[PDB]
Amino acid sequence: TGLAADIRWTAYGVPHIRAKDERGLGYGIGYAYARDNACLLAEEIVTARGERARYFGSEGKSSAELDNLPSDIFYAWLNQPEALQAFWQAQTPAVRQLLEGYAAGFNRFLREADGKTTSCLGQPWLRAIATDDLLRLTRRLLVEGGVGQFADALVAAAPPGAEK
Amino acid sequence: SNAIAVGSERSADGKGMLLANPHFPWNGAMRFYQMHLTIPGRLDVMGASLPGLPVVNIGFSRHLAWTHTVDTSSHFTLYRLALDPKDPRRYLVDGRSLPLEEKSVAIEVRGADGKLSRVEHKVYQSIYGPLVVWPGKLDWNRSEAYALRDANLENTRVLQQWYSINQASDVADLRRRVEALQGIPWVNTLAADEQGNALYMNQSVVPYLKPELIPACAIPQLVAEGLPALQGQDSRCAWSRDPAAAQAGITPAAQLPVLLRRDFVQNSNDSAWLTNPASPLQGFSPLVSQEKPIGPRARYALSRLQGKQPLEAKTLEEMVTANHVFSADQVLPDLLRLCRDNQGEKSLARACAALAQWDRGANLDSGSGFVYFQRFMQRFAELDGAWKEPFDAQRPLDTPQGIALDRPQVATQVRQALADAAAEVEKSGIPDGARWGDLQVSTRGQERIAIPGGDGHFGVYNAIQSVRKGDHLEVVGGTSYIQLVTFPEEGPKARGLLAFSQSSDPRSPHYRDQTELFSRQQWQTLPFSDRQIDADPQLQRLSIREAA
Ligand SMILES: *[B-](O)(O)CCCCCCCC
């Protein structure tokens, strides 16, 4: 109920965010990160939503060098609505507020961006984000120590036919 | 990644000191970003974070600094299923036939037309998790298949965990907060505080099996090859439950390696074992920590850290900026001897010269000896019994060492590997007298910036990973966020850089400013206090708000 942040940038564009609560703090983080890396985050959210083949077709790859379609299959499987919902409901109020603030702050920069520090201005995949998108990234990060390393292997797993 | 924490018994000022040198990608979803977070009165922390996360992952606060390295613990298990002999879509648990579950996902695919079409894919799942196939190793035939259970799928505590770390006061408090929540997914944690404690924790989310279960629950041939593979046809091979664990089936905090000392702790991605050799860490589950030979980065670090001489901040910085190729110390002397024994072999002439002039570093100015050495080592690594003194578990810091040139079969093969490597290098297009900096770069728009450092597998503490792209080696990962923190009375003194700069966008004023600095290895103040922040002549400020 009121997002506000105070941001200072020192040399090299390092942001110092001050706020009275987690929502405000997240707001400043999402705004400042977007100023530097909106296109990066937009791209990786597309990946984590399992939508690479939708925007870019089957011949391309993610920034992890997985083919777009197997990558999409894996992250669609990983980030199903039920899994995201249970993950959210297990978050503390403070963390929910951090995340709600981040999304709002990222989206504020997008609304105002005129391309000064954003090269992908106008791209259909550069769009407002939601807290679910941040959960998708978090879960994607979580499984890098596990099933994420086997993403191709998961997609390839099909039962045998009539072979001898 | 490297990490070194120094305590009151070894630091020049009698207080804590921390070097953080994570090795991570230079692009994509794991690209570090610097930021300082303050809620006045209860939160004040600075460091770097990964994209999308509203917390600091590696950083420091008023009395504390902490960092991470990828650990060697397993964070998942493979399960070998015994398939129903009548139906390869069913599997046996305690002799009972269970059906695989099928989850279908649908994907939109943009075609040459620009039109979308819908693709449907079946994901097969067992009680353990999804099935996985590695053709020729983990197949799915009429007899067996493999499922994978990832422990971090149930780790809903990861964001709370770093937010809690962000609020930690000192090392004791840091340890309490990490052991209480057990939300760290797959890294070690090292830390130092003002008071001069140095902390190592192998405190992550790790599948738990009671020790009596391990001999029969393992797949012997697969674990011998490094895979955490369990027998999936036995219900007793389920992850063990322990009420003290924060999550069902993971290892309680008390059974995970922790080392709290006042001299030092270190890690360079080996196991907990030799974090500090004066106090070896042993007796843990094989899922957690094993006594394996340490890699050359850790071997290098230990060779600089051992002893009784005080460690200054400058000492830790230069362990990174020296760019010393520590692998050369084990191999190059005997290699150079073989060269002197084979003068006149014209095919070895260029190589042996280059290796002899080489400063044994991965500096911008380092000669082509590095390139010759790399290609040789890649071949040397495939030879059998070529070490003069093989790994000795009773001398883990000093072995292996040397080339077994006294054995003719080894001398012939080493010379051949040098010949092959030399041919390979000269076959490529490396100009006369090109230096390492001429070859390894990071592209920024249509310019290139020369990048010092080399692959960690050759024992360069400043680990840099590159790939061949046209006429150069393009940096893809490695040294990334650097922070070196000390604790003078005025407040935390932090020094470092973000190697690839704050922004991934070419339009940004901060696309390459720190990268130019990384090239010259000129670390900078990381301003934390209001007085440090206000003293910066580049200071900019913006306040923003909007209704909820
Ligand atoms: B290094 O072991 O090569 C990489 C360590 C990075 C730590 C990341 C912490 C946030 C999840």
**Matching residue, tokens 């550069």:** A126
Q: What DSSP character marks residue A115?
A: S
Q: Is B70 in the pocket of ligand 1 (CB under 6 A)?
A: yes
Q: Is B441 in the pocket of ligand 1 (CB under 6 A)?
A: no
Please state how this structure was obtained: X-ray
Angle between helices B369-380 and B328-340 (to 10 degrees): 100
Q: Parse chain B into domains and list their residue ranges.
A: 1-75+151-290+475-536, 76-150, 293-474
H helix runs in B126-194, sequence order: 158-166, 171-181
**Matching residue, tokens 């973000």:** B498
CA dist., res. B501 & res. B510, Å (int): 6
Q: Spell out which residues of chain B touch residue A90, defining contact as CB-CB under 8 Å.
A: 156-157
Which residues, in sequence order, are CB contacts of A161 under 8 Å at separation 6+?
none
Main-chain phi, psi angles of B408, to 5 degrees: -50, -40
Residues in chain B: 548
Type of residue found at B3? A
Do the strands A14-18 and A3-10 form a parallel or antiparallel pair, or are they unpaired? Answer: antiparallel
Is A2 close to B527, i.e. CB distance below 8 A? no
Is A37 close to B547, i.e. CB distance below 8 A? no
Is A54 close to B158, i.e. CB distance below 8 A? no
Question: In this structure, what token pair is assigned to residue B208?
Answer: 């738990």
Which residues, in sequence order, are CB contacts of A82 under 8 Å at separation 6+?
none
Q: Are A135 and A48 in contact (CB under 8 A)?
A: no
Question: In this structure, what token pair is assigned to residue B145?
Answer: 């298949």
Q: Is B535 on the interface with A (CB under 8 A)?
A: no
Apex B276 CA angle, B272 and B278, nearest 5: 125
Is A142 close to B185, i.e. CB distance below 8 A? yes
H helix runs in B428-501, sequence order: 436-439
Q: Are B257 and B201 in contact (CB under 8 A)?
A: yes
Q: Spell out which residues of chain A touch residue B50, defining contact as CB-CB under 8 Å.
A: 141
CATH topology of domain B76-150: Penicillin G acylase, beta-roll domain (2.30.120)
Burial B203-237 (b: 16+ CB within 10 A, else e): bbbbbbbeeebeeebbbeebbeeebbbbbbbbeeb
Q: Are A88 and A135 in contact (CB under 8 A)?
A: yes
Question: How close is the Cα of B201 to the center of ligand 1, in Å?
Answer: 14
Q: Are B371 and B439 in contact (CB under 8 A)?
A: yes
B61, containing H or E segment: none
Q: Is B405 helix (H, G, I), strand (E, B) or coil?
A: coil
- The class that CATH gives domain B293-474 is mainly alpha
Q: Are B540 and B532 in contact (CB under 8 A)?
A: no
Which residues, in sequence order, are CB contacts of B383 under 8 Å at separation 6+?
B410, B413, B414, B417
Type of residue found at B167? Q
Angle between helices B369-380 and B408-427 (to 10 degrees): 130
Type of residue found at B287? L
The partner residue sitting opposite B39, judged by closest CB among A20, A141, A150, is A20
CA dist., res. B420 & res. B482, Å (int): 38
CA dist., res. B28 & res. B408, Å (int): 49
Question: In this structure, what token pair is assigned to residue B466?
Answer: 């590159």
Q: Is B247 on the interface with A (CB under 8 A)?
A: no
H helix runs in chain A, sequence order: 22-48, 52-56, 68-78, 81-89, 93-112, 131-142, 151-156
* Residue A163, domain CATH: 1.10.439.10
Q: Is B490 helix (H, G, I), strand (E, B) or coil?
A: coil
Q: Is B24 in the pocket of ligand 1 (CB under 6 A)?
A: yes
Active-site amino acid positions of B? 1
The residue whose C-alpha atom lies closest to atom 8 belonging to ligand 1 is B68
- Please report the residues numbered 472 through 531 in chain B whose beta carbons come closer than 8 angstroms to any beta carbon of chain A: 498, 501-510, 513-514, 524, 526-527
Residues in chain A: 164
User: Domain range holding A140?
Assistant: 1-164
Question: How close is the Cα of B187 to the center of ligand 1, in Å?
Answer: 7
H helix runs in B341-470, sequence order: 346-357, 369-380, 408-427, 436-439
Architecture (CATH level 2) of domain B1-75+151-290+475-536 = 4-Layer Sandwich (3.60)
Cis omega before residue B400 (within 30°)? yes
**CA nearest neighbour of A37 among B239, B498, B227:** B498
CA dist., res. A2 & res. B128, Å (int): 44
Question: In this structure, what token pair is assigned to residue A91?
Answer: 């978050």
Which DSSP string do the residues of B187-241 spell out, in sequence order?
EEEEEEETT--EEEE--S--B---TTTHHHHB-HHHHHTT--EEETT-GGGSPPP
CA dist., res. B325 & res. B456, Å (int): 9
- Count of the separate structural domains present in chain A: 1
CA dist., res. B203 & res. B252, Å (int): 9
Q: Are B34 and B51 in contact (CB under 8 A)?
A: no
Q: Spell out which residues of chain A touch residue B108, defining contact as CB-CB under 8 Å.
A: 51, 53-54
Q: Are B441 and B475 in contact (CB under 8 A)?
A: yes
Number of Cβ within 10 Å of residue B293's Cβ equals 16
Please, how many CA atoms are within 13 Å of residue A117, restricted to the half-sphere of its CB?
20
